[PDB]
Design a protein around this ligand. Sequence first.
Ligand SMILES: OC[C@H]1O[C@@H](O)[C@@H](O)[C@@H](O)[C@H]1O
Ligand SMILES: [N+]
Lengths: 94, 93, 9, 9
Amino acid sequence: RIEEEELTLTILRQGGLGISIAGGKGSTPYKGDDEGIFISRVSEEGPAARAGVRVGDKLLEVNGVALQGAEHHEAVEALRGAGTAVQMRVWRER
Amino acid sequence: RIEEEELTLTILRQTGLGISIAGGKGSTPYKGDDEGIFISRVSEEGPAARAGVRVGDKLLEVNGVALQGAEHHEAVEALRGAGTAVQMRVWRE
Amino acid sequence: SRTRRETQL
Amino acid sequence: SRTRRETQL
Ligand SMILES: OC[C@H]1O[C@@H](O)[C@@H](O)[C@@H](O)[C@H]1O
Ligand SMILES: [N+]
């Protein structure tokens, strides 16, 4: 992890975040041996795209809920109950 | 981690190991955001090269010492005190 | 030999 | 902004 390089993006839900997530502890890794939660898809018309979310981003926190080393369902539950504003901490390569 | 995809290579220490490691928790990552212990160099004439070790391998255990989430010095101490036979399991591919 | 999981949100 | 560490063994 590189927490000093992480980004914070806020999705203003209008139901509907306009993303797909993949991965999780014990799941088939999204890339290499990384079992993290990744943004696998971003809808061009959804709020996540407008908030600056991109495919390939690694999801590390959602509204205070830490997702480092989390199982897939834990991220889903954190995102489904996040509320109108979904503050996500992500890491991307630059 | 993918334990089903890991390799186990046994290095016969020379009367060294012929490798360099880099990375570790809190250190500059060897690649991306991965703070794991990586093989950064492999001497072409050293025992690690002949034992099948390759640059880029992620080091996960050395003679029972688990290195997942370990600091750099923990890997060094585990490898330096491993003995004449250094059984390390790594992940590649 | 794992379960691939993907969820649209 | 971290310490890069490399050790020859
Ligand atoms: O492919 C695996 C590697 O991908 C890189 O992008 C790193 O972020 C990390 O995931 C590492 O294990
Ligand atoms: N799940």
